[PDB]
Design a protein around this ligand. Sequence first.
Ligand code: MG
Ligand code: ZN
Lengths: 264, 181, 118, 97, 148, 49, 240, 121, 76
Amino acid sequence: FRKNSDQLYASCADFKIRTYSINQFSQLEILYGHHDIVEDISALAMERCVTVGARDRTAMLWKIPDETRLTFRGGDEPQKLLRRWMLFFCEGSIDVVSMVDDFHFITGSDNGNICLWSLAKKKPIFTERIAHGILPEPSFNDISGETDEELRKRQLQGKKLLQPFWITSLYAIPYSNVFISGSWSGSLKVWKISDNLRSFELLGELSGAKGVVTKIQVVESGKHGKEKFRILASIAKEHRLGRWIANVSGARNGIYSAVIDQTG
Amino acid sequence: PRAPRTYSKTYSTPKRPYESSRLDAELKLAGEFGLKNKKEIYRISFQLSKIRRAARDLLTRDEKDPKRLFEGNALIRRLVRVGVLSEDKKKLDYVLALKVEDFLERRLQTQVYKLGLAKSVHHARVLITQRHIAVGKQIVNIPSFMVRLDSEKHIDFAPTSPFGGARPGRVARRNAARKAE
Amino acid sequence: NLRNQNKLSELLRRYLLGLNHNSDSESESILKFCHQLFQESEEKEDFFLVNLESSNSLLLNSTLQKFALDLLRNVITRHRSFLTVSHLEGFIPFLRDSLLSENEGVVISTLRILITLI
Amino acid sequence: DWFTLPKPDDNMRREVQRDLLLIKHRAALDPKRHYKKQRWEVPERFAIGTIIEDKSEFYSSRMNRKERKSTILETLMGDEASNKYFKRKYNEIQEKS
Amino acid sequence: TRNIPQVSSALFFQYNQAIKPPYQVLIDTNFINFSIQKKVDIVRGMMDCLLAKCNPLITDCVMAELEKLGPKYRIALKLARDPRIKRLSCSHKGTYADDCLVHRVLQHKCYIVATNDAGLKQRIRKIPGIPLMSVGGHAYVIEKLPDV
Amino acid sequence: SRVKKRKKYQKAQKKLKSVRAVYSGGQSGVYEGEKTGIKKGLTRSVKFK
Amino acid sequence: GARGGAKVVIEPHRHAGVYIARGKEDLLVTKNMAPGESVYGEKRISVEEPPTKVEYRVWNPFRSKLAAGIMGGLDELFIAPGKKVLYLGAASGTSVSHVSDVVGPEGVVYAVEFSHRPGRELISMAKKRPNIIPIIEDARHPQKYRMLIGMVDCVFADVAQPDQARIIALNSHMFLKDQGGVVISIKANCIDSTVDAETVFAREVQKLREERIKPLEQLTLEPYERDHCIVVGRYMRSGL
Amino acid sequence: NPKAFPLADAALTQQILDVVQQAANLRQLKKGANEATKTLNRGISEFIIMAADCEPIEILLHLPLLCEDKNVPYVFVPSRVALGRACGVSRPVIAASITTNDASAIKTQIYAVKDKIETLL
Amino acid sequence: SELIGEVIGARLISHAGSLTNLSKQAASTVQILGAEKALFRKNKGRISRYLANKCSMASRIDNYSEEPSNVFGSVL
Ligand SMILES: [Mg+2]
Ligand SMILES: [Zn+2]
């Protein structure tokens, strides 16, 4: 929903974005340009919505009044990243997005990369690789049927089979320097954007959640000077789009809650 | 009076139209791509001849010559954009290696057939000319439309088409009405 | 060509004479510079590609080796201080390599410096 | 020798002679089948063999035992559709004659 | 045993759907003189006529044809040994070029025959799907090449 | 004209089969043998002279 | 068609060691070396001979390129009874076993293969066939297995490699006899997918000529396969 | 040395999964182990893809045996769940095959990835 | 052996001709491989087909493991 208004933006699997006027119960426009399913969408007070194209790996910000669109692409390659260092997993798909500002937004990839973006720059301005860590390595007693333990260990191929967590959820409080990321790692991570808006750091973590964090929301109350924030995140045993993710031990279906207070 | 509006013929008759091998070539091409007449093949041949002659002139020129660099880069860019030339053959030599079949394969009729929206090239042409196919947000009713690399993924049924979610055509609702009565 | 090589050789000689009157020759950075020169000195595709037309690297290294040896001899002879074992210890491995080089002139320059260090 | 086929016995049975006739005139057996033109003569050495299927080929390409017969002829007798075609086709030719 | 040679899979009736750019061209001995005689370069002239890269070929028979000629035609021999010209080996005792070129084209439907000989040209034209190249007037001419 | 050329081409494809064999998807189902028969003394082999 | 229970009449092929099984549909069939079993599940034909029960195996052109050549009507096959054979690119016994039948007990077949996984089945199949000698090695280094291989009258190569001509030349020089046979199967898609099929054949034939092998035949394997041909040549050691 | 071999790098896996998704939309993709086995029997497989973390891995070691008999390129991807995502199915996929079709609209991409796989092997 | 039984399993190998042959074969045919002696035997047919795939499941593990174990067979 466009903030403080009745326009609704709907992203559909037919590679299109549809726009709606709830007060009028009618369709306004159909928006074209994504090459693959438009998995997530975000909106702020202005009409500048942003969307993410999943395997297309392109975050697009759309100017509805101007009928123009801006294309943003990561362009990150584990080759060059290793050489400048002299485990990095190539970006596979982008699945979450939330607009920190009308001039900034963040996106989460399936390789565990949380990237900060600016409208001026097409490439990312800052990136955080493997934000949620690496998935557990498969058990050796289950990888193969060979009796000898050394043979089964070889099938693990060391750390080559390891893969990173996916950023199932990502939400940023409007016009703030704090955003929350989620996965099935079993903990919610809260990040703080630097005041200069060219970097962000990990503010803290919340381990209460156990399961797939399908969506995250934040609600606040109290006086302007003293505010208490409540983080609500839907928790499920399976990913929202499909059942691909193997069962996570201890996962339960419920609504996670975390109340945080401000002091200084 | 008003200044003239320029015009130019888009095709040219071949040198010896009655060559048996040429007749068989035209037959095969029309059969594959569902072309209406020999004028389309002549048109594509004329365009290809112009492109290849320009490429020849540029190749004759010395390397690192400003005209060669500029004009060859422009021609390679255009040929890559239209999709005839691939990203990894960006040289004038591969431009001289192009054939008519590549340009035919980029036609919107052939693309509609390949992508599966139609069961045959002729069915693709019939769908195109009946205003069922949209390249992005625009309805295209011209089989000779050349599809760019980016536009390739956006070929779909038009919203107004009965196949694209609109109401059924006149025949369908007519039959439904008479059945109801 | 050989004639152009002689033209170059005269030019490099004139550069060497200039360095003799240059204050950088009095500084120790020049030995490092001479050190730098020494170590610096030491079908289907054709089926498509049109063709319309019917090794000086060793010479480059030899010329650079010649320039550095000539420069090194000039500096040590002009200023007695650098004519010491500690300063010229590192250039010994270059001298032995130069003694084997096919070019006689650079070998001649190698002999000139060795006589200076005898 | 390892590569030599058995000779047909002189005064050969009527069944084996006839099986050669069917192969000679196999073009006329089925209206919907045609064969490359060939002048077929009885080979000097030959033998009669029985096919053995793969056990995985049970449903697809096996003949049930009752329909298995000692000669290729009397199998064609088993086929009703083939018999019906012959009964008709012989009727017209006689009428024309 | 009888033989009826198969029809090459590259031919769609009289259309050779296999000869496509870049082309492979067989050079006959007389082609070189008329190339020199008209001041037409072999590679560029071929390349201008077909607007494509042309890879000339000279067989041993055609090469052996040139040496027997003598000093009068030294220039033709030198051009034939141009590095861009690839060589083909021969497995027939006769040094005759006519049977050599006719046999090669009868077998493999990839070659353009470059010749001005009336007798040889007539033989090739009967062979279906064989583009025939010759030099006339001021530059080369291709007869049975639909892509042009 | 388009319909006329359509019928002409598909007619041409049938003739090409008679002139020479043309690949038709390969094997479908169990190998039932050569339907049209094997010829003994016949070779379609193009010899080097 | 050729259902399990039907009967067929066997008779000798034009090439020695091969047979045809006529009927409603004919079958190219070779006499079995190890009766009572099938190596790739092929159909088999049982014949009663004075009584001993000899067994025949059906040769599938669609599975073996060599049989498709015989289907095409190849004039000369050096593969013959009592003839030593060097089978390169022996992926498995699908085609080697049939070749082992043709040579007969007196002849031998030298199976050469590189990859281990298909090699093992070659070993197991070869243990059933005494006349087959499996060589699980790279054909690119013939000197590796030079002891295991004597003179071979004919060399057959179905290796799907781009530069197969080099492999064929090295083996032929060391092993193939004077006037020996050379049979090759070429798939142009592996060698050069950029250029058409026929040109790839033209380039390959030229390479064989460069390697002192006189070509005697080429034959296209259509309808059994696309973009395939079999080239038959004789090796002139002294000079092409 | 490991049974699952060769294993495509992160970059190559990325290129592979793009092709698989495109084939899925064009109905050129066969998903699952037994389907891939059927295609190899038919000689219609362009190349096949297997997941290296298959649980257990010995389930998909028959397809390589079929491939090197049929000379069909093959390669392993690290993640089965990622492979499941590209195929467009709601469940993990441990094997998939690209059907051969000489008239497909994604002809060029398949040969691009094919050439890389043969180089890897 | 653990999934079905030693004697029945030994039969199925003999039908295939070798353990390697059985593993290479697809799931549907393995059901038809034992369809003569009712080795695996509308609801009844479903169990047979379901068991056939699992029988094909077990064969591959045994063939391509140098020292196969029974842990997977048990859970199977
Ligand atoms: Mg309309
Ligand atoms: Zn010759």
